[PDB]
Design an enzyme around this catalytic site. Sequence first.
Site, PDB file in Angstrom:
ATOM      1  N   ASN A  37       0.914  -1.120   0.000  1.00 51.61           N
ATOM      2  CA  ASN A  37       0.000   0.000   0.000  1.00 51.61           C
ATOM      3  C   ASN A  37       0.968   1.186   0.000  1.00 51.61           C
ATOM      4  O   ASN A  37       1.592   1.497   1.019  1.00 51.61           O
ATOM      5  CB  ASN A  37      -0.840  -0.024   1.265  1.00 51.61           C
ATOM      6  CG  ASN A  37      -1.759   1.167   1.381  1.00 51.61           C
ATOM      7  OD1 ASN A  37      -2.656   1.173   2.213  1.00 51.61           O
ATOM      8  ND2 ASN A  37      -1.540   2.183   0.559  1.00 51.61           N
ATOM      9  N   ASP A  86       0.362   4.420  -0.310  1.00 51.54           N
ATOM     10  CA  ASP A  86      -0.118   5.674   0.262  1.00 51.54           C
ATOM     11  C   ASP A  86       0.155   6.823  -0.701  1.00 51.54           C
ATOM     12  O   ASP A  86       0.432   7.948  -0.281  1.00 51.54           O
ATOM     13  CB  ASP A  86       0.583   5.961   1.579  1.00 51.54           C
ATOM     14  CG  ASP A  86       0.007   7.160   2.285  1.00 51.54           C
ATOM     15  OD1 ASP A  86      -1.230   7.206   2.425  1.00 51.54           O
ATOM     16  OD2 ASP A  86       0.788   8.041   2.708  1.00 51.54           O
ATOM     17  N   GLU A 114      -3.885   2.034  -3.092  1.00 50.66           N
ATOM     18  CA  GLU A 114      -3.965   3.457  -2.766  1.00 50.66           C
ATOM     19  C   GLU A 114      -2.921   4.222  -3.574  1.00 50.66           C
ATOM     20  O   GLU A 114      -2.137   4.994  -3.026  1.00 50.66           O
ATOM     21  CB  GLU A 114      -3.763   3.723  -1.265  1.00 50.66           C
ATOM     22  CG  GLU A 114      -4.229   5.122  -0.852  1.00 50.66           C
ATOM     23  CD  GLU A 114      -4.155   5.398   0.632  1.00 50.66           C
ATOM     24  OE1 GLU A 114      -4.629   4.569   1.433  1.00 50.66           O
ATOM     25  OE2 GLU A 114      -3.632   6.464   1.015  1.00 50.66           O
ATOM     26  N   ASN A 168      -8.106  -3.781   4.843  1.00 52.41           N
ATOM     27  CA  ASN A 168      -8.578  -3.008   5.990  1.00 52.41           C
ATOM     28  C   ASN A 168      -9.284  -3.777   7.087  1.00 52.41           C
ATOM     29  O   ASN A 168     -10.499  -3.701   7.231  1.00 52.41           O
ATOM     30  CB  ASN A 168      -9.476  -1.868   5.522  1.00 52.41           C
ATOM     31  CG  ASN A 168      -8.696  -0.616   5.220  1.00 52.41           C
ATOM     32  OD1 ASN A 168      -8.110  -0.021   6.113  1.00 52.41           O
ATOM     33  ND2 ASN A 168      -8.679  -0.208   3.960  1.00 52.41           N
TER      34      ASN A 168
END
Length: 276
Positions: A26, A28, A54, A170
């Site tokens: 991920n 970010d 992401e 998540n």
Amino acid sequence: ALYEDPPDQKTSPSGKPATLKICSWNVDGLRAWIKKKGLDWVKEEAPDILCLQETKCSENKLPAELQELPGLSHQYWSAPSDKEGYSGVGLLSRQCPLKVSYGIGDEEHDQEGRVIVAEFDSFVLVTAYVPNAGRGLVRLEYRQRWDEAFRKFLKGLASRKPLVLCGDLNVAHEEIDLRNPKGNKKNAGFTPQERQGFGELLQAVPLADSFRHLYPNTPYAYTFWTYMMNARSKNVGWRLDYFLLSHSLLPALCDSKIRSKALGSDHCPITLYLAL
Ligand SMILES: [Mg+2]
């Protein structure tokens, strides 16, 4: 309170050497990530297939560096149509997939570029960025709806080939997957509704938590640390990144890693070895 990722185990349970190295991270944000030299560490890992979540970046606004990755020349992006700096997932591969499709085929959940699916000779890889139930659990209902659309979707793909799911899903499955269980049961990522939605997924689409499968008792192993208060520094994290797979792939499971020290995001990459 500290964890050390064991050495890479590159052989199957029958002594079969690993043939595939899948890396999921991920980022970010592709640009914030590149800047932190994450595209650096990647060159070292040299995976066969790299799933990114992401990306915070449409497929047309891709940085020049990316397409210029060393082995991963078969790229596939999926971003929100009219957005930016929000969600997004990618799946770069050294080898060209058989077929690639996006979303889980359910109009309400294919609006935010969260899922990419790639079919390969021996299996089907599915990267994902499960929607966070956000602060105040204001998206908890949607999450409960997503969980089902996905679980159901997965089971279908499963009925065609063995399955592998790389991604930020998540959710901290068990209390051992997050540094503060006792106080996050009301926060997105560790609510009954979510936790017991992950479990029901593993139970319905014959899927295994590759990491916990191999390391049933290792604690403090996380993949996410909040930038707030140098949480990473004190190792106050959440293992939200997984590599779930078909029970029919355990025979090929060599090892499942957690690159605790690779920098570049508020998530550490996670790699997977399989002997195919
Ligand atoms: Mg993020």
